[model samples]
Target chain A: AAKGELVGSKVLVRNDRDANRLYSSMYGKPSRRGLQLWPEEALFLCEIGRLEVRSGNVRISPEELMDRFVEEDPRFPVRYAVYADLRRRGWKPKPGRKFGTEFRAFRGEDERIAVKVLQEELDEFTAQDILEWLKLVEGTEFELVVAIVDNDYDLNYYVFSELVLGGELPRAKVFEGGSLVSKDYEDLKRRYFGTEHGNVLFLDPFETVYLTEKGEIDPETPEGEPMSVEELLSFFERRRPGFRAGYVVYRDLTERGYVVKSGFKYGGRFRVYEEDPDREHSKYVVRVVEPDTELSTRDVLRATRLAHSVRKDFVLAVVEDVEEPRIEYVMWRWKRL
Target chain B: AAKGELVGSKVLVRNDRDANRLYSSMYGKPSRRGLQLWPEEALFLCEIGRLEVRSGNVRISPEELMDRFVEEDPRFPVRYAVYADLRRRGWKPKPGRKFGTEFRAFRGEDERIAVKVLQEELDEFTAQDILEWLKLVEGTEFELVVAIVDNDYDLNYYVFSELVLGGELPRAKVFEGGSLVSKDYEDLKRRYFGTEHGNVLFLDPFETVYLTEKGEIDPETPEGEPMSVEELLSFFERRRPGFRAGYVVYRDLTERGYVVKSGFKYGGRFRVYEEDPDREHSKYVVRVVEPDTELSTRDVLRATRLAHSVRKDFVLAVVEDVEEPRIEYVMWRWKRL
Candidate 1:
């Protein structure tokens, strides 16, 4: 039993020979008196005939021993399922609690990757839940992969990248909300058009230009004469010096499926959400730059700092292509020398 | 002899036991049957009593064997000296020809750094010579340090940083020229001075501000009243843009042992030299950024490209704190995402 014992949740192997053998072959956490293996590890070892648990003339099989733990965890079934998938794929998995992960895959000394267990059917996420997951990914020296389990019991995995949410609006904003419309304007009224002020919603100047261009509205000047996007563009330039560049980027973001909003408070040009805004928070605070723009180190640092304070990623979009207007996105990585 | 012999230029060891022993102990290149060692490696091993090279009735000592090879390479004396210095500092050096360097320092498997051989007195550098040195520094994945061996035969080490050559003028420009100067301006004439038009050395606006401030020159307007640094500064602001920030940086480079000048063709704000420009090419082409400036990625690319095409390093200097007006130098790295 000291050489190999299934004691409660652990499979302990002592004596120099067996313990040293398991260690040299890349199994078990070498302990002072012996070596430690989880029930999952023992089950795998039993599958390979490297270990056996016997007591009082009864030899416990991997299936029986797994059942003995009940399977103590509700998530245990899926956790072990993920582990088997990783082992079959040629990665040796060790208990992740040692690294604060569910399983940290190893091949020799490289602490290759960390995986968190998830059952797609049972996993529900709050904004904080997603934040905490990514917090550790960014928190660690390496990134994290969310390995999902399904009813098929095979594994699905995704590596976490910074969330870039655009107002969580399913579609990009054509114009935030529009100018006064007729009672017959019911189609435009409730459909992603504008924010409501009680039962009434009004569009800003940007919305005005967009709707007029789309022939969705009959907008006129104060005197009720016909209006044009030309007037709106000029009026926009008067209000904001860099409105043309901002407008091009705004158009690109919306069409790219981000529900964009002005990120004035976030120290960026726009705040974007990938999912519906009400479900979670905005993911990115993005700045727009022209191809000829000269950025100061302080300015770039300030934008990233402000976005991070609000738990968002910062992106810089440059209007590099002018004749056929296009944007190039560049993400800055902070490095220390 | 395959156990390790001082063969012509190398020490070759074949057969399993001795070769594997040297390789496992972190020596030699493993060939099909055995491994290989350089004379430098053999010399170090002999010192540690791990190796002895003998002939019939004769044992070649480290010094005797060293003289055997050199009495071959004229640079051999200093090469082995550099080798001994490295081994005493606890670095294991293999033959650098394997890595395209004179000596690549190694410990275990990490190829830590590369050192090229240099003798101060005999070595002469054209601008091309310095360019080739830095070409490989920027050429390889790691930077280079030029190790100098003096007549004293002791070693001196210095790392290469981007050279910033000003106009090769010994002193910072007080001015390119004035309307004219008195023939009796002998006091200002020929020492730490200007690019002359046959010895007139009239002061330009920048030199006017700097020299006038330093009490080096007296000036009056065409109207003949006493002049001030204020008029020159304002005039400088008009001729070229961003004069104030540029002036602070210019003053800094000049006092910090550099000759500073306009770097218009080089696509940066200034070209600065640590050594006199007459000796070699300008080392750096620098762009000044204000604290709140927003630099376009393309613009940064443009600056670096122009500087590199001319064999110079590009630097961005940001005036971070307006109150203190201190500059922070940030070097942009071209990274592929």
Candidate 2:
């Protein structure tokens, strides 16, 4: 009944026959004397009654095995849950040391992914860090999967990826107010572009930037002379430092085929539409982040609260600085189990 | 023995003898027919084996009671956990409608607090909103206690208080370079002030504002004419819109008996030291927020990650605008269970 023996806190299956036996079934590493099983693998096999762990002549109970394991790795619960789930769900998992996390598992032949197990009790990771993980898998055969283990010991799998965005407008004499003002508004307001203030239509900063870039609006100075997009961006950037990065997010969304609006009411950079704003409420209220925007707990709590209040998804757009910066949109409700 | 029965979705203990029975014990409402129990009360009593709930001809199981009650209120689990915890812990809890949340619970004869039960899964509240609740109990016989229910149905009680901050220096001939610089550096270097590149120590923007506002440094232009605090503020404000609010937070922290330094290293607004900087490391890396800084998930994630990496507590300082704005410091790892 005892398939594995505890050797100075390490669990191993000692006989060559059984070592190769457990290895062929779920895969374990061969040593000079035995086969080596990782802590989670040992626990998973013990729990399912496939293997038994013995210390001396005394057998280690599943509960004892769990307690002993927990003492060594405080994150044992999350690791074990993800490991057990993968085993039961038909995945071939190896120790994650090579991949810089908890587990690396294969869904099928040549379908391998690096898995990171996180706890719900503590939120220790970030969108930027996840992007770093995304970067790790770029030249490798493995994809990245994050397993969030909640307080209930339940697992939610998120496949984190950097979305590839391969990514128009009208001719108008648009001028700048606190927002953008178009004296000659025609198809602009008709297509739900801006808020009309008596005689003129008012567009937000981002909307105006988009319009100007698309050549819908002939960018003009307050003195009514031709202005360049470069001049307009510099002006907004002088006023608000977050403007340049925010503009990157706004333009990215527009290029990706979504209508974006000012999220002043929600207290974010922009509210985004998947299709048409006239058809439905904007689906997401997104916050713009520079590559190095150091976010803390309160900012996240505040952002999510604002989004939840209005029933919209919250996205963080990290602007990767290029000559023309590319945006990497970060979201995780799309990834959780 | 059965003390209560489910009567058309309401749990009631009929008859005058038993009407005030549970009422006197833990305090329930007395209708004309009986003592009425809220869903949490019914569940607590049922689990403790004192109440029986019947719908039609069938007595509902505790598990089934949970399922059926979950239909009526999805927030029932958190509500019930907090209510049950309060009742067993010898607190008298009334339904929170009288206040603004889940319960208004009494700790002692005259001590009352508004208790809001929040789930950890969706972070749907903010430091600003928590301060609003702090405002709610100002005129009343109450304080605010936020009960965060984790995925394990465990509760951590946090007392959210708006820090009431009721809030300098030497004579150095200081002039603004990119940062502040002085031809003669005295106690500044000896007391662990700024980075000394050659004979002059360089101060960050906030430090310069502090020194300029105080009598420590004489602020002058490149032309060497003394500049006023107002002109310097206007200059910094024009350069970075967030600088005004950031300076307000910096000034407040300096006045609050702490050493504040630029957290540019941590990517936050400031690194704060409780004692002298030479004695120990900075305890906190705090971010400055205007009353309206629309914090989202990424910002929070980034901030916390930065703070976590350097082993410092992350706090948010919200500037309440005035002639001289007050700073309210917010943290809730200070509160969570």
Candidate 3:
């Protein structure tokens, strides 16, 4: 969940008990009560690292993603990479053509078992998305479809699909380190904000509050309430130590024509495009790097930052300069200075 | 069964048949019917080498031996040595005193059991002497004794027990190369001996017969059935390539006696004596050979000939002396001229 409004605004909610109760009652539980949740739990964090996101390119909203994406989604360029990952972990990847969900996991030799994943645009209905998503896949024979939401911090993405699936678990899931799930940002700020945890992410105040407490973003997205990016950033800059640009999530309370894009922690959120189920879509390769190595912030951010300046072939180049204590930097050829 | 009446008369009845039935029964089966019995069969033809019989002068009579010499007969010597040349591949000392025989054996903690030898005079007993003796130690558990007999040629033996305890198997009876049973020698000489297989003993016989067969002694006493020593020398001289010796048995056929001494092959038979049964026997120190780079045959023979000679030490010395195919006899101070 991303905030698009300033703190203290009508739409923003802090330790607002009534709002939190409603939110919690609606979303399962308080995402996490008070600690820095691990990366697996903080999956919804805005991705704010280097990427090849075109200046004005559009991608599929999570809603438009059909079950066929489970065969290896062409929408997310990194899906194959993720597919390779889950496969290596011994999960048999089956196409979700008729299975109803993205992938089905079976352990030994039996087949009538396992969980599935269904990607959906979070705006249409967070509760319904979780409900219908759960219903379409659950029965005596089927289990839950993991709900993956497309979250671009810009114009709202509309490629919503009730059938979207793939990228499931019991297997390790890879997420860009720069991103902080709405739950984790608050936990880290309170724990290791200026230490190894927070400094690792280019965290800002508006993003912090929007992620941690939903500064101005309507608690109930179905009510057609929208928060400005500046307001969201204001909350993030205020709540966090260093505030930076680019943070947004749209289509709040809007039935159509609103897209969430820009300023994701690493890359754009899970956006499925409206295209042939088997056709190629916006795709780019990402190189995973070790953050705790003798490397500069530049190196890691370049390897993972979703948006960056380019010089011909090089988008973001990380120079391996430190020999002892080995640190590196993500030196992007800054856009014409 | 030895050669002439004086031959090695020890009968190793391996065929597991009643020799008396086969010899005297008219109803004997076809296989047993040796109607054309040979001349040697009438004499003691089973000879495997000579073992001398020397006791502390106890002359035993043939008529009274049966009840006197079995286990529990106080006159029986538990420390006598039995050497059958047929079993001369290598000889380990005898074993056990629990059941009539004693050897170098492991006793309880801190003690070693040893072989007990009887004196020559004590060993000789008349049949009446044996009966009187048996009366003296009637119920006492004396170790069972065996007769060490030597016809002039080859020496061997027989076992005696008060009563045959059917289920008790002989324990600690180990054979280095092979086991020695009286029947083995008996059958080996079946062709040479005539139909009968009674245990026989001999004094010196004709030279050649003495040298090779020694078939003249009675299996009992050496008194009347004896041939002269000159006859034994004559028999040895006649048997061009054979070895010969003289031996004795108790005068009483019922009192069993066996080899207590004599030199044939593998040096002389080993004799062990135990003076006190209730004390530590084997703990008495034996002087080890002086540490020398090279030990001679005399040194080894001293060890082998003397009952105290360790068999392992003696064998090692014998092996070290030979080279190639020929095993030259090693002559030293211990060799007779």
Candidate 4:
């Protein structure tokens, strides 16, 4: 049994040196000598019928503790709800002081979830803030989860992350012909291109290299094995010089359910159709670039005006990394208010 | 006499080839045949009693022209007011085709003002858009002026430019026997500090360097003269090893009328006081960086938490260019809605 009395902002149990102390063994964190319970911990203990909070001869019930702590701490309801949810789903919730967030949820020691609490109204966050949260979760074991508390204290969670677009693309099919056959459907499938019918294969440089690295295609060498990334790059440079970073962008858009084709007449890398390539006109003009590519204001204006002339959204698709390709699309437009 | 008649959206001057054609000679752009006038020009010409517009067979007076144009064009009242104001002030206004704005106002050849017309509702602009406009105006000969048309049809112009601070700082006074000397009233005035009784000197590395650059102090060189920027930088490195990019941040805040001091204890480069330093504590903890500084998520979180612990705004001060010395402050805060 857990019994705690209210101190200032914390609730403490005194002189509980019993052998079967469930607070330390089961619920609360074990300190050097005893269990240390925060207000949330005490309220949680009371909420699950494990503890009764006493404030100088007055017994505080679970509802009373909830009201008292919620009034004292504005974020109490959110923290309690998140903790309860995690606990109900067979997970452990701990303080996230190390991550500088509200809570660190754990299925185990290594697998952690960093939860950042917020009020429901999203007007308080800028685009940069949201991007930073996504960046925080990237390449980390902890998943950054935003827990939004509504007016009625309902919790809404959104997991923010840097998306890996085509991690599960199909491997290249076997090619029968040699010497870069242009019109063969099976050869196109081997090169990761779409058939005239429905079999649309992703043909980005990364996917080409990915399939080759995975031993699904025959190399140009006499060994008949897949070529290396460097060798494949050299082959592209010697043969199809136009498919440079543009292929990366093409792959990204194709994977994202967009019909991407050359925008040579439109003065960009690709003209993108949103859903159906047959029915819908191209809605966007995308210029491909490495993530570090810098452009002048004049260049941006040129692209923007060209897109306006064609009545399309001007998107700059920046390939972030070649190894694990992530495309970030930035749109530039001039609006008359 | 010069005469015009409204034909659809434009006014066409019918046979105004007199030797003393005031529209071509004194006011409007000289065309080969005659002067072409938009609604503003027609309204202005009618307002000055120089021309009367005839719609079909009816002679349109100034009041009638104003009423007709205001009804036909939504931007008529704004353009009319701005055009009338410019003409009354003895300046010529032309369409800003090159700048892609509303007007290129000219007092003479080579002296121009690029005016962007806007309604008072300013919800349509992003930070990037504003920065782009600033960049557009940076090295150009034309002064960028935002002409805002208020709800009552009154025009208010705000001239936007990069602020040049410390233009009026005092020149350096000769320091007679100065090895961190005690109070010298004349020296305080020369150093651009306060008066003798309350002579508080701004001694941040940036303020010191800024005053030195403005000829307000002599650097501790062997020649006892004003040291070059490179020379003073070496001296600062020898004396204060910790003051790196903090100098740029300090200069930025100080020049912007904020009282900046070291935030070593607060875990940042500088603590900034907005209004009164003596009565109020600092409201911001600023971490200085290069304009192209790529911050890790951990670094951002660290600075954010440190600023939050001290109950201040976390400001990321980026020195864009050393030559121009423009500092852009980006504030990041976790807010509840």
Candidate 5:
């Protein structure tokens, strides 16, 4: 049912108005104005051999159409290669002009993907660039996807998203004064420790919950005792001097009624749970830095992608030493159209 | 005469003393403790297959060495591929440790090139990263080169240099009242235009060096008249409002006694000549920016490459608006060790 063809650098659409109406009703739009198609789309149609195109009264072959497009834009082969792959994978693709990308693809109605076309030699990008791309998909259910076309025109795809922060902190359960192996320490931990704060359970060689000092884990100890915030800071200083910044972040998160766990394995200072750890995975992976820190685009991209790979949001915690020491949370946001 | 092979993620020299003496006399200090090779150099040797490397038990094969080095550093393939190209070109290369690069290549005793290896999928870099590399090469005669390996392992090389400013402006010759076809304008422009400042000869349809009101090119007119700096600026603003910044840079270069020519075709605002234009080509291409303007790494790379392709230096001029406007010159430099 597709009767289209290429004419030199142009796509000659015979009975353009009719062809436009037919194509518009059936699947895609080559152009909203008349029946002209971009050389890219024309080549695809030609390759499928469902369209007829003429070059100066002579029939133009599909291979010639491909060559013409490549000659026009050096990047055309890569973009078209990616676009054709998406179509082969059963997607309905449209130009992503408003989103500053190659295509907006749909599989059925609910699932959408924003695809950016990249050449094999793609080298550098700014954090601002990725953030802007994500912002375009924000509000919509569309997922951000990157399609890289290698030297052989082989395509590889990667999906990206801004991990969302959700859920609530588990309620804190009170604990009474306790011995090393007392029920108060165990019960207190069962109710609140893993819920928002702690992830490891280290039973010592003596078969007791591990605490450096006697009152460290006691719930009902006096306000100025070992379990207090000041004592924990002092303990951290004595244990590992460099870990003080991490303690600051841990203290801030816990004070705000959120669960904070060490994110060492995830390359973050802390993994924060908005709600009980038992109910959901931590939503935010935070890195603490001095207030005057300046982040390079590389640092932002590395941390952002690392967090995305683990399905969590990346947050930069800046400790400002103002009149009162305050923590600032900086999270990346993308532009959405 | 290679004696080492890849072993357990490292290129181990069986007899440290002898191998160290030979390799240290040839190229690179891979390891100080022994006569070892970097994964990059080992991979290059493996590709050549002439180096005899025996493992503790059996002789090592070239393919095994390649696989081992690639496993040790994912970037080894790219770095080695570039190193291989350099060796194939008949250049002697050594590790660029002091300069923090992949290789320092020498065509002869005096001609040196610093090579920085880059991967195909490299995403982002910081200004500081580039600046530090430049600082290392600052005082040397060695040229800075970047080799980017694409998906298929093909390498693209780019050479960079610090833009230099030199030369003195030609004496401003005097001209009396001028008409479109006046001999005064022709003589005046012949002495100052391509000699110290302007390049394009904008002729009117009526045929002559184009000028605004009379006396624009007439240097003999009152100091406050058309040929004055203020009048020239106003003329540019009236002709092309967007060219004011360009004119500011033009005036600054000329005022500083260098010949500045339009760099429109070069993708920059101005091209600066260090000597008589007839004797030498422009040595620098300048982009005018605001003092607070921030450039992304890609922008810097693209501009730097453009200038390098034309065998000139790239310069960024930042103009600040104080009571009396001041200009600051920032140019890219490479580290040489």
Candidate 6:
């Protein structure tokens, strides 16, 4: 609804019907006319908005509150209650979402603007803690954006991230781990020992078979395989090459008196290249030839600065969105004999 | 009716709701809720009053008018309108009732605190002018109050005494064929001859009978006569004795060759006691009498001032309200003899 009028100074001070129309339009019965006329509402919004924003928050006395709302339904008169209370104390806040933040310029001794984010939650203890934290930081201006999440659940967890803390896109790091039986070994056989681009010369097959029978060839599968995303991710992480995602602690060999060669893969009816397996360098990159994947030239360098050696090698892996893998997974993998 | 919120800086906030409510009550609905919740029905009156005052006649802008009136009516919205407009143009004013003015402030080259008076007729004009000119000349801080005679009507006027022109209120300023009388004779004859207090003093049969033979008075019957209590109040003005009210000439005085006089009567019947009529140093008193009425030892001075002879002997008569005495002209004294 429009509510604008021209000042008496603007027109001749005679019997002006137009002026009278403007006056009547303002002080008389309102009509649907002048939707395009002077913006009385806008003028008001701008005036009150500007005034309130500049004034900050004003408090509303209890008496005023009683007179204004108690007689009404009093459904907390949210906007007015907040507006009037702030107005009394001197806050001149404008209404609506155009401001982005609720209650503008509510800061003290600070130049930065304040942004209040409110939330409703089901968990009492957690919600209470959040409410207290918010209260303590009431008038604080943030140097960086902070998330005020409201986790509504039996056991709630909230995450507050500063703008300085960059985001972690879903999956930036990756790993894999698996084994195949003799019948599922044709792909590997073709790439390593059979007629293929690369050849795999066996290091030993009988000993590997013996170790597998004794459950020592691999320490992978256990009693009850609980299916959890974190668990599955960890299973692959344990097999990361060059210990890309794990740490390696060096020992005093002479004092310990023994070596603990614990890792993902060791021996096989497999031909694998042990790159840079020299006496001085403790880091090693092993490439299997017998149960081979694709053939590629690579190098292994010791990056001492990184606590754990990161794998510099990359392989193309296909992830199936649906149940059927098509044929890509099998075509890309190497199997054990 | 709290129309909207005003959020802004220290110099821009609003605190007084009484004024707004008074405005709303006078022009809008009875309550804020009615203005806010049911704006479609009860038109906000405060907004209407302002519109009528501003647009001069009565019409207002269509869309704009509806928005505010249909919403919650607010107080001083029109004043707020005037103020905001003025402030935007860089003339800041302080809200106050001091200085006998509707508003008080200085602008540009104006060093004096101007007294702005809102009047619906001529009487208010002179009173307001007196108060303002007094401030300009004497540098005294005084308020000149004026009451709007009616919610309707729009007129303005100003007053100044002849002393400002180095003259006086005209006494012995004869009407060609009429009898000239002294203050004492005027009291005894007028009070004793009239049968009523209102306009009867003028239409007395005995007085008219003598006047007809004397051929001095107009026989028009004076259509426009102060016949009511409201009319009686308009006859005499309220003033203080020591701080006498007078006029200041903007043009040459002696060349125009007019006389100046002072008195306890409306016709300037009493001349300043001859000792020192133009003395700037000696203390002087102009018997401030609301003629056709009574006087007291109190109300001796409206206010004191340090002004020059050329500037004029002025008094600060603060017209508190435009009062009207009881109607029906019944003379306090009447006798043919």
Whose TM-score is greatest here?
Answer: 2
User: Candidate 1, residues A289-317: lDDT per residue as tens digits?
Assistant: 77557553234334544554567777777
lDDT of 2 by residue, A246-314 (tens): 887888788777777765445466778877787899888777776666654334444554555567776
Worst 10 residues of 4 chain A by lDDT: A173-182
Per-residue lDDT tens digits for candidate 5, residues B267-321, read 4566787657768898887877764454443354446545655677777776665
Among all candidates shown, the one with the greatest lDDT: 2
Q: On a 0 to 100 scale, what is the lDDT of residue B127 in model 4?
A: 34
The superposed Cα distance between candidate 2 and the true structure at residue A256, in angstroms, equals 5.7
- Model 4 residue B169 CA deviation (Å) reads 34
Docking class of 4: incorrect
TM-score for predicted model 4 compared with the true structure: 0.31
**Tens digits of lDDT, candidate 4, B81-115:** 57777776767777536565677788866767777
lDDT accuracy of residue A41 in candidate 6: 19
Candidate 5 residue B65 C-alpha distance from true site, Å: 3.3
Query: TM-score of predicted model 3?
Result: 0.13
TM-score of each: 0.29, 0.47, 0.13, 0.31, 0.37, 0.18
lDDT for residue A228 in candidate 4, whole number 0-100: 64
Question: Which tens-of-lDDT digit does each residue in B62-129 have in candidate 6?
Answer: 23343333123322222333333333344434444555444443456543233343311112223334
**What would the TM-score be for candidate 1 when compared with the true structure?**
0.29
**Ten contiguous residues minimizing lDDT sum, candidate 5 chain B:** B200-209
Select the stronger candidate by DockQ from 1 and 2: 2
Model 6 achieves a DockQ score of 0.00
Model 4 spans with C-alpha error above 4 angstroms = A1-337, B14-21, B24-26, B108-111, B164-258, B261-337
Clashes of each: 35, 16, 151, 0, 19, 82
